[PDB]
Amino acid sequence: SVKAQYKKNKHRHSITNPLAVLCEFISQSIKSFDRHFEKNRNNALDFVTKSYNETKIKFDKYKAEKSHDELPRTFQIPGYTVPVVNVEVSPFTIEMSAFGYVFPKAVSMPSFSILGSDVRVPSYTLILPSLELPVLHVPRNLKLSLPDFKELCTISHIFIPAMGNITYDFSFKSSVITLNTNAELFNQSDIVAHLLSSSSSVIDALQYKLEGTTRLTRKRGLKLATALSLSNKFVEGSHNSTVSLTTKNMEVSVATTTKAQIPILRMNFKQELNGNTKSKPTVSSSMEFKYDFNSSMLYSTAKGAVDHKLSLESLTSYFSIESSTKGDVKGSVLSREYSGTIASEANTYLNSKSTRSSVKLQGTSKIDDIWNLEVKENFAGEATLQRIYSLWEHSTKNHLQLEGLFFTNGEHTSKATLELSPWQMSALVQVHASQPSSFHDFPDLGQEVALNANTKNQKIRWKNEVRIHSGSFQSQVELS
Amino acid sequence: VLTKYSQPEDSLIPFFEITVPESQLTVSQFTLPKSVSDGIAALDLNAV
């Protein structure tokens, strides 16, 4: 039996969209334009007054005007009407000064009458010096202001459908398997979706229950809450998502918990993410995972957990980001132990004056109790407006072989840094930390570099030392 | 801003050292996604 009916409702809810927000913003822009017009007219007047003073002597005093006179230019555009668009075009008059050459003449105009408002015809009043007299003066005090556009500030519709309920039920019958899933969706104005899947069978795995409800409300902004639960023998799924908008603040939370029931490999994981923004966003990130493994046939078993925590703080005063993770695992293989544990701390700091970031690592791990001590791959850095400092890859290592005659090697660098300040340049470097061992007394090394500069006070020290087998070497160089 | 006549220890050369003393500059606060205006126009982002 299959049902897919739909009581059709073709109506909608038309929410008027308030374009008035733009209608005031454009007015603010026009205000700025008007004041800038005043300033520009001031700047032009500064030149125009001097130009009038210059011209006076040539034009008004000396006989250089009013000969072969020309009538003032006045252009009239007759009015018009457009019934289809319902637009009344008022007559438009444009004037130029006949004296001189095409110099502007004062003009004023209203706007045309139109049906609807997609654009407002610009009415303007323009006053400028006329060359029909030698007198030139700019009306800074009369700034030009166009009519701000009101593009139907409230005539446009956000559509919220009035659809009826969507119903779909699936049901099948049989001796061994029985399935009945119902999905119901409600769309009056908000969204409420619920799903129910029912499976019954003679077989254990084929029998289960799944339930799902998703609820979104829009009357006062989008506020959603989704919860899912699974009832299965081998899978236990719990999932929780809820995004809520209270018309001012933003809440997000993810609470998912699900665990696997596989015999040989039992697993459990868990998700937490709660991004919240009351005034400054605050975000919590904690990821936790567990795993239980055992392969009897392979005689290999291991347990561990990889878990992470991220703290993020984007405060206006400063921005702090903190992250650290722990890769943890223990196991045994063919009666030989598998060791692994990785820990890291990442720390970054930012600010207008100073920023810092130091991340520490421990790769500590070993296989069958061999080749151990993966340690200290850390760094540190700091930057302030006053100075600069750096420490990069100080480390330490020592790895042992448990076969043969237990050869060892753990070569690594020693700490070495750099500090910079005004008038002072200091650079110290110590490196080559090595591990001698069997087979002719493997190398033992080290190296010291010292640089200190104070302009004419330049001191440089260098030293190398080498030890191997039955010989050794040491070199020294000094420049003071 | 000052100028000092000095004979540095690290340098045998006599010098006039023009020194600009440290300066702390106060950046005024400001509003963000509440309502923003820059002297040309004002927009209400919450209204938007």
Residue with tokens 């250089």: A64
Alpha carbon of B37: minimum distance to chain A alpha carbons (Å): 9
Burial degree of B32 (CB within 10 A; 0-12, 13-18, 19+):
exposed
Distance CA A53, CA A57 (A): 8
Three-state DSSP state, A88: strand
Interchain contact, A21 vs B10, CB within 8 Å: no
Residue from the list B10, B32, B43 with its beta carbon closest to the beta carbon of A25: B43
Distances (CA, A) of A291 to A229, A296, A298, A339: 22, 16, 18, 15
Stated length of chain A: 480
Return the structure tokens found at A415: 């700490």
**Minimum-distance CB partner of A457 among B10, B37, B44:** B10
Token couple for A388? 């600069």
User: Hey, how many other C-beta atoms are within 10 angstroms of the C-beta on A218?
Assistant: 16
Q: How far apart are CA A160 and CA A165, in angstroms?
A: 14
Nearest to A388 by CA among A355, A430, A359: A355
* Distance (Å) of CA A235 to CA A230, A327, B14, B18: 8, 25, 83, 76
Cα diameter, chain A: 121
β-bridge partners, A360: A345
Instruction: Give exposure, A412-443, as e/b (b: 16+ Cβ within 10 Å).
Output: bbbbbebeeeeeeeebebbbbbbbebeeeebb
The resolution in angstroms reads 9.0
CA distance B11 to chain A (A): 5
B-contacting residues in A 9-28 (Cβ below 8 Å): 18, 21, 25, 28
Q: Do A25 and B13 touch (CB under 8 A)?
A: no
Alpha carbon distance, N-terminus to C-terminus of chain A: 98
DSSP for A290-331, written as a single string = EEEEEETTTTEEEEEEEEEEEEEEE-SS-EEEEEEEEEEEEE
A354 beta partners: A384
Helices (H) and strands (E) in chain B, counts: 0, 4
Torsion of CA A105, A111, A112, A113, to 10 degrees: -160
Distance CA B45, CA A475 (A): 70
A21 contacts in chain B (CB < 8 Å): 43-44, 47-48
Task: Report d(CA A271, CA A307) in Å as an integer.
Answer: 10
* φ/ψ (deg, to 5) at A444: -125, 120
d(CA B11, CA A456): 5
Question: How far apart (Å, rounded) are the C-alpha atoms in residues A192 and A170?
Answer: 20
Question: Across the strands, what pairs with A260?
Answer: A235, A267
* Cα diameter, chain B: 68
A451, A428 contact by CB (below 8 A): yes
